[PDB]
Scaffold this active site. Structure first.
Site, mmCIF file in Angstrom:
data_model
loop_
_atom_site.group_PDB
_atom_site.id
_atom_site.type_symbol
_atom_site.label_atom_id
_atom_site.label_comp_id
_atom_site.label_asym_id
_atom_site.label_seq_id
_atom_site.Cartn_x
_atom_site.Cartn_y
_atom_site.Cartn_z
ATOM 1 N N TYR A 1 -15.564 17.377 -16.167
ATOM 2 C CA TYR A 1 -16.034 16.015 -16.396
ATOM 3 C C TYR A 1 -17.092 15.614 -15.373
ATOM 4 C CZ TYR A 1 -15.693 10.867 -15.834
ATOM 5 O OH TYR A 1 -15.966 9.526 -15.672
ATOM 6 N N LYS B 1 -7.800 6.144 -20.126
ATOM 7 C CA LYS B 1 -8.042 6.561 -21.497
ATOM 8 C C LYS B 1 -6.756 6.384 -22.313
ATOM 9 C CE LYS B 1 -11.710 7.613 -19.260
ATOM 10 N NZ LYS B 1 -12.208 8.950 -18.988
ATOM 11 N N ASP C 1 -6.212 18.693 -15.287
ATOM 12 C CA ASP C 1 -6.587 17.362 -15.753
ATOM 13 C C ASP C 1 -6.168 17.296 -17.219
ATOM 14 O OD1 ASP C 1 -7.964 15.129 -16.866
ATOM 15 O OD2 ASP C 1 -9.487 15.206 -15.292
ATOM 16 N N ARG D 1 0.836 -1.197 0.000
ATOM 17 C CA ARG D 1 0.000 0.000 0.000
ATOM 18 C C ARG D 1 0.869 1.244 0.000
ATOM 19 N NH1 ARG D 1 -1.673 1.969 4.491
ATOM 20 N NH2 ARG D 1 -2.516 0.055 5.428
#
Ligand SMILES: *Cc1c(COP(=O)(O)O)cnc(C)c1O
Ligand SMILES: *Cc1c(COP(=O)(O)O)cnc(C)c1O
Ligand SMILES: *Cc1c(COP(=O)(O)O)cnc(C)c1O
Ligand SMILES: *Cc1c(COP(=O)(O)O)cnc(C)c1O
Ligand code: NA
Ligand code: NA
Ligand code: NA
Ligand code: NA
Ligand code: NA
Ligand code: NA
Ligand code: NA
Ligand code: NA
Ligand code: NA
Ligand code: NA
Ligand code: NA
Ligand code: NA
Lengths: 380, 380, 380, 380
Positions: free
Chosen positions: A99, A196, A171, A47
């Protein structure tokens, strides 16, 4: 040196131990310590850090010209970690057409935690200046945005943020580090839905974050370790693998984008086309100043819903699916798929008409993509 | 029927399509739609749902006798999602010795979002009743806790939570669904670091959450989709795989635990032993009432730091590493590894002495584990 | 339609069940049967068939314009299966400079099984006609070969094979299905080390075989099921993934190949260059007749061993490693790495001089690759 | 020390570099060389050796008390490599009821290469002595065999092989290294379909081979590198992972086997039961002398085909599928599934009656398995 070379040789994506030319997949949760506190290579619990995730983090930091990279289990996990940099009472400015996932996270999750949010039209940066409050701590922009590809001036955004003591975030999903590097323009933090273009193969959900700021990096690392939205090692490996062909894919996509736009502008069944390469597009000059290529997302108007559905049915090479940045060309109707909860008249007011089609251009042959879309439009 | 059978046949872990007897690994981000909105099998975007993650979610829901399962990228991501059920101004009661990661998340992340927190000794449930404020919304307990294995009455905790309108949460990591089922005792939400026993092989970082409450499930699903701390498909597959042997592993671990405790209690170099199976352990009767087996985590006192380090050096089969629930037996010194930032005198006051050793019992041979630990203790 | 489109949409690489746009990874060995003999989708045991392997098999069959595809655990496993089509007493004709692994398999394994082998110079096809014996059953050719890239006429080879009743096989590894399709020229069987260009990312060892002949396909399937050299599902998935960018990668590689060859021919420290694009290369016209592009493997002479080692040391972007078809540009010295067991004077006689360098051109920037190799040559 | 400990700590299954407590998955085909011929850790090409495959090879060599391990893409690939130790004209003795895949490979593939084969009843070892020819080079035995679990004396087989200069091979799949170690009894080569118990989770097709003989190991390594039937790194990792619980799984399976056999022997609808634990089973004493436990495969007779199909339909916890060694209990009808091509009267003569049922006992609860099978038998 040049971008296509940096994509192959930038970052640390080999095994120093065996010499393996690809990053080993450390499917592991914990690590032997030779003595209490003595870590062989700095690892102690996956982690906190995993060597395959460290590989992808080094790649995104290299490609964005930052110092520090972070891999999250999704784009919205990356966005959430960045927002968790703030406290109750702090205020964020975001572009108005951010978005949907980002909008939903901010207005339905983080407002319950006392974080205040305003969505303003950042295509004029003085809107940012007007929106700044004494409690504003962050400026978050996407450029170009979805699905009408509005362009925001990154460098001016960064100057405004520096002058007012704001953390600036871009972004950079739609452009990728291959065409636009917000950190080079003064932005504090750059993030991506690696789901993406970066992964590029529709087979990883992931977010990536890069910064050059040591203190922001320490805070992001603490948030990542504490809230645990980390990307796993197999997905990190597939990300490193997909990024290798980023440049080739983006260039093919751009050749097709340019030819497809010529076709769309000529076609009688198409009205408005939205893309930053069109010279009459708002802030076209700004985009060309801050990027050296184009996103593969295009939006354009046909007459109505039935025309849009007909277009989807008649294309052989445009696939009806969610997401973008695939090797396949993808097609969608925002008003039915991403904005169907917005009342119709407000949809129309924002430009999300019934006949608004969004395509995400893939890496099929340019002539095939042009001809297929044109013959389908000819059936209207 | 019986537990070992339910572990193999419970949940949906085969492919209806091909008949594959294992869950296919859907390394994929998006899904064809035959018509806008028409999903073949309910999938549309892997952040929202992925069929391999759905498999592991169905498994954890079955094993805990809940209705709804959720897989997160880590235990602390699961905990964070559950805490994000609350709003600024809401108050949480947690047991005083909650896991360090949980403590850190609550006091260093979520307090910045206005969530209020009190840590109380829940071994007496009237401490919970005294701590309840008008703003209290959640009661979060681990039992048994780390590293002194304090036991909390789950059923009374649930009654208290129901009477006062609190969401009740149990971190059931140490016991696993094989030995303790908090939802059967009235608890609203059960969670796990699947990183430990459930995965069981030290090769997945993951969290799991189960509930029977439709409305809590809808809120958790919204938070998961919005903040995106989702477990990936490869890690979901490895989780489903590791859970198959959960019962066999836990039973081997329990046989060794019982023999090791007999040895520790007999040995002159060992002072206090902490484990719920010891009849003089606080709330031993409560543990036996709410569980039908034991965790493999044991803590015990040796004289000082140098004795603890000597013990680690002299064991052949106890490995110095972070985490628990491995197939390997693991050994650690809390005061040096998990509590080294707490001032020494407060450490001593809490019982985290310099010579406090924590072992996590693995699945090696019982006699080997007993004999190895005993000979190493004999070197003191 | 066009090649780059066929690469994306050819073959079956989606999930009919969920609609997943990528092939699910069926990490599974066996399949439920609803009734004895009734297979849900034709699967019953993964050695015999696995749906992810079936995906990659359909891809290679589509790309080579065949009917049947086969995935093996390595290129030499594919070659071995094809050779196992023959019996003791049967005879094979292969080109004289066949790949070392192929040579080793034939002369050190299959000759012990009574299979007879002759290596002839197939750059003149009448050498094949002269070598045919009454026991000859197979004609096996690579074109272009390693490392001097000798070219063999595929179509004439196929005519000869048909006239004499031979199974014709082409190892199409160096050209890939993107540039050369032996089945279209009458060849019975085409094979590949998918370890090289098809996977394309140096992370899978695999072989692929395609044929249009139903009876040869049945025999290959029987051999695959009986000797079990099958490709696993994870490697099959990575193969399907890497093939998506085959066209883009090969085209970038070809642009660099052409510029690099211009540089090499101009450079004073370089003597002979071996590549089928050079017009004075033997059978250049034949290659252009049977292929529409080029392999990325180039060989060229420098003065001696120390010059070759200096060249390797001085390049920043050419990596010293075994194999070809990576995204990285690779460099090697055949005389030291692949032919070091051949006596020196015979090495020299074959053209494998001490200063013979082989590069496998990757997908770095063309100017970077040209300039790097040129400056390193300038240090000689 | 004891077996369950050796399963966890035997072999090399950690990362020396990072300290990772699990074997990294080296999804890679090739390796950087610092100088021509200078390999960092001995790796140069994954077909020749891969560090994850090396991990699983070290595990199987440790567990069988051999020196050298080999991982193949399937059990029959392992068997094929071992047979390829021989030449045209050499002769093999195998037990008469050898596994169908082995029979098929030998009689339909390797006989075409001039290898001669005799199948004899090895339950009397003097049958081996009678079958030895001057050309015999190998003795290959399974014990216990499928599906009637015939037992062969391993130690006497090894003595015979040593006296006559034969390579001795045992297919130890059904017993696993946890219960039977042929190399300890003088056998030259031991092999496994790791597809069954060793992987243990129905999700890997793989073969494993172990030997203590340096020269046989060198020949096997040459055959593996030349014919390329190698196990990939992901499957190697899953094998190492599944082997960790081998002991726990086998012991659960054995408890159920014993109770199920008591039930079967008592039940009026069951005639003959075949299993080496039954004291009237041929060579029961031999099995107990050479093994310290039992396979989970049991065969037993019901009246006819319709009874067998009814039994399959009526069990809730016995799954109709191919293969064995799953965590699930599996059920099959040899006469319909593995021997349907043998004429009926010869089937009957061999004991493969229409009502012969084979179960492979899994790790479900013993009482559930007994009760389920008994109630289904009660429906006859
Ligand atoms: C060229 C290069 C860089 C530097 O890239 P810039 O865009 O100039 O910052 C870094 N790494 C590698 C591997 C490169 O080839
Ligand atoms: C027995 C069984 C159940 C029911 O379990 P309970 O503990 O009684 O709730 C569910 N699923 C399977 C596969 C079972 O075998
Ligand atoms: C064009 C195309 C084909 C046909 O390819 P040919 O080279 O003409 O044989 C097959 N499949 C797909 C997906 C294609 O686009
Ligand atoms: C006990 C042990 C051995 C030795 O096993 P034997 O059965 O005695 O040959 C080897 N390795 C490990 C890790 C062990 O624990
Ligand atoms: Na690098
Ligand atoms: Na900066
Ligand atoms: Na379409
Ligand atoms: Na089930
Ligand atoms: Na309840
Ligand atoms: Na130790
Ligand atoms: Na297709
Ligand atoms: Na043909
Ligand atoms: Na170099
Ligand atoms: Na070990
Ligand atoms: Na021996
Ligand atoms: Na059944």
């Amino acid at each position: 040196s040049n971008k296509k070379t940096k994509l192959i040789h930038g970052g640390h994506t080999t095994d120093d131990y065996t010499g393996a030319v690809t990053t080993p997949i450390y499917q592991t949760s914990t690590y032997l310590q030779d003595d209490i506190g003595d870590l062989r290579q700095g690892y102690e619990y996956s982690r906190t850090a995993n060597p395959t995730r460290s590989s992808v983090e080094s790649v995104i930091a290299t490609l964005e010209n930052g110092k520090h990279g972070f891999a999250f289990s999704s784009g919205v996990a990356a966005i959430s970690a960045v927002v968790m940099l703030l406290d109750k009472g702090d205020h964020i400015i975001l572009n108005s057409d951010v978005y949907g996932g980002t909008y939903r996270a901010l207005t339905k999750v983080f407002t319950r935690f006392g974080i205040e949010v305003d969505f303003v039209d950042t295509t004029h940066t003085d809107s940012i200046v007007q929106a700044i409050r004494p409690t504003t701590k962050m400026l978050f922009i996407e450029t170009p945005s979805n699905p009408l590809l509005r362009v925001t001036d990154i460098k001016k955004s960064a100057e405004i943020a520096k002058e007012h003591g704001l953390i600036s975030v871009v972004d950079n999903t739609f452009m990728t580090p291959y065409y636009q590097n917000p950190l080079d323009l003064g932005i504090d933090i750059v993030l991506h839905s690696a789901t993406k273009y970066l992964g590029g193969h529709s087979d990883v959900v992931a977010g990536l974050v890069a910064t050059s700021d040591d203190k922001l990096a320490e805070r992001l690392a603490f948030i990542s370790n504490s809230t645990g939205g980390i990307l796993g090692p197999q997905d990190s490996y597939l990300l490193v693998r997909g990024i290798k062909t980023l440049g080739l894919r983006m260039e093919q996509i751009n050749r097709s984008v340019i030819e497809i736009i010529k076709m769309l502008q000529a076609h009688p069944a198409v009205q408005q086309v939205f893309h930053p390469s069109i010279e009459s597009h708002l802030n076209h000059d700004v985009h060309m100043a801050q990027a050296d290529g184009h996103t593969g997302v295009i939006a354009f108007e046909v007459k109505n819903t039935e025309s849009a559905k007909q277009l989807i049915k008649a294309t052989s090479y445009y696939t009806l699916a969610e997401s973008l940045g695939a090797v396949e060309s993808l097609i969608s109707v925002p008003a039915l798929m991403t904005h169907a909860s917005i009342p119709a008249d407000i949809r129309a007011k924002e430009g999300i008409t019934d006949g608004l089609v969004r395509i995400s251009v893939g890496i099929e042959d340019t002539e095939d993509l042009v001809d297929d879309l044109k013959q389908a439009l000819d059936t209207l």
